Amino acid sequence: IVGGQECKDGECPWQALLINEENEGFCGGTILSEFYILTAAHCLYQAKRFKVRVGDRNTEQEAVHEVEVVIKHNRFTKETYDFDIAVLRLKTPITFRMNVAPACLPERDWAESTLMTQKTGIVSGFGRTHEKGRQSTRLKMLEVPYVDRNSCKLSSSFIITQNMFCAGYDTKQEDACQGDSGGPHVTRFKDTYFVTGIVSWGEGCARKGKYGIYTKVTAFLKWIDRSMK
Amino acid sequence: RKLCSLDNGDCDQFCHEEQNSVVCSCARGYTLADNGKACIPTGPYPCGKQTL
Numbered sequence: 001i002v003g004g005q006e007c008k009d010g011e012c013p014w015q016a017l018l019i020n021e022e023n024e025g026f027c028g029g030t031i032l033s034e035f036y037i038l039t040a041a042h043c044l045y046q047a048k049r050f051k052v053r054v055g056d057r058n059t060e061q062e063a064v065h066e067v068e069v070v071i072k073h074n075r076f077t078k079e080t081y082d083f084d085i086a087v088l089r090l091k092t093p094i095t096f097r098m099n100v101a102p103a104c105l106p107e108r109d110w111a112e113s114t115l116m117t118q119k120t121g122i123v124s125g126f127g128r129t130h131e132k133g134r135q136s137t138r139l140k141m142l143e144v145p146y147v148d149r150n151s152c153k154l155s156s157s158f159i160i161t162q163n164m165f166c167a168g169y170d171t172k173q174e175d176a177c178q179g180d181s182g183g184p185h186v187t188r189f190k191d192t193y194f195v196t197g198i199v200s201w202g203e204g205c206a207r208k209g210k211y212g213i214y215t216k217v218t219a220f221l222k223w224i225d226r227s228m229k
Numbered sequence: 230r231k232l233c234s235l236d237n238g239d240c241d242q243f244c245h246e247e248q249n250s251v252v253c254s255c256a257r258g259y260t261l262a263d264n265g266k267a268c269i270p271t272g273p274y275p276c277g278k279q280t281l
């Protein structure tokens with residue numbers, strides 16, 4: 001996360017971190033329930049074996065869960081990042097506590113008419129804090145304005161499918177960045193946070209005239225429901 | 230603005246219109262309150278709540 005603020009105690013409890021063999025974070029995830037994590041399909045190629053960490057806001061000062069089943073969308077394309085979504089079923093259930101809680105999955109039509117129409121959502125992760133930099137040791141979050149679909153396609157050098165949406169700032173230098181992929185984009189409605197996107201891709205980080213591109217969760221609610229059964 | 234378009238039909242969470250009337254509902258782990266509008270957590274750590 002470039003710009004934004006540190007997640008304070010209890011503010012981003014649905015954040016998950018995918019960590020490699022060397023226990024270094026390489027992507028985020030969102031906690032959906034005691035057994036399931038939502039992430040980006042493209043993250044699954046950034047490590048051969050990985051585990052999921054929850055509850056840590058600081059990777060330097062200390063729960064780790066192994067993955068049982070990886071459910072990847074059969075239509076994910078490396079070429080366009082379309083269908084950039086996966087669900088992980090963990091071997092052991094997550095114990096909810098301070099800094100560890102699931103985000104809500106919304107009902108589809110209501111999400112589209114009420115959440116996707118809000119002014120902003122919130123992205124979070126342990127990704128880089130500058131386009132060139134190391135992964136963050138602290139969990140960060142950033143309020144990102146929803147971006148008009150037409151404005152977004154006009155700003156992009158790559159195709160924006162209906163499975164994606166744009167969020168961020170045109171000029172202000174704040175964005176998700178490398179290492180944040182697969183993480184939560186949530187939208188608050190009356191003090192309840194609903195999962196609305198998955199961090200997916202961007203042309204650099206915080207580049208003028210570019211926005212962050214996210215997997216549109218509403219396009220996959222039935223898919224997610226099915227995967228969790 | 231009418232029904233669900235008017236302040237989310239006064240619903241805490243999900244609002245649907247059935248037969249030109251508001252019907253509120255809630256995410257898993259919440260129960261719809263007696264007023265048919267509020268959503269009450271069934272346990273600690275309900276979804277979507279910061280742990281403050």
Ligand SMILES: C[C@@H](C(=O)N1CCOCC1)N1CC[C@H](NS(=O)(=O)c2cc3cc(Cl)ccc3[nH]2)C1=O
Binds near residue numbers: 079158204212213
């Ligand atoms: C443009 C895109 C890319 O190569 N794509 C793959 C093919 O499909 C189109 C996107 N790309 C190149 C750099 C960028 N890598 S990154 O810096 O790790 C990254 C991810 C990401 C996510 C978001 Cl939401 C904002 C910025 C951002 N930067 C990325 O995803």
